[PDB]
Amino acid sequence: GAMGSMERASLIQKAKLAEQAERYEDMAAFMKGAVEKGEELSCEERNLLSVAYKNVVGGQRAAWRVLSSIEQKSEGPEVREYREKVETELQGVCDTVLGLLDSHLIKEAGDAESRVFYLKMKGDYYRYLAEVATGDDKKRIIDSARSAYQEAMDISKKEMPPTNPIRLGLALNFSVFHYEIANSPEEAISLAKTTFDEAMADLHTLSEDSYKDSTLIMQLLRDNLTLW
């Protein structure tokens, strides 16, 4: 890639500059370069990575949904063609992120928090692929997302308390996957409910700030339970 000749520290510096300038494609490219140096990321760095790509893929997903909406309200081939163009670009970005996670962020993650963080990302970006996938491809992608999320769940249950915000956010996104993608509403509801109850059990032990952190995400679980 184009970032191979730049120092790791310089890439991180420029990623932060890009963020200040709201240049998220640049930010993502700089963080990809940093990851490809082969060293583990700090907590601050993997959050830079996640922010950058979430912004890029978020813009693409929003555009895809605008075009898909126009397409479905549709007499020419142009809306479909342009929707497919945006789709292909979105798929490219997700493939890039998944490639970073597989080579080799997940296997080199040195603690439970980072492992869960990366496995959750893997589930998320397979989920974004699933949103625009169709046939047998979609079924393979769905199984890949589920397996990544489930591995993250297994680690989080063994290594994190039930009120931990990363664990809660993982359960939130996995339950969304069940409902929106895998057409498994019962699994979605069961997961959100169990997560909610097990967090509630420990709220009384938390500091004020941690109580706030945990109940915030519990309310996101609750919003979805109400909707479902």
Binding site: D124, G169, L172, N173, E180, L220, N224
Partner: peptide, 6 residues
């Protein structure tokens, strides 16, 4: 359905 922000 909304996933974790942002």
């Amino acid at each position: 359905t909304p996933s974790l922000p942002t």
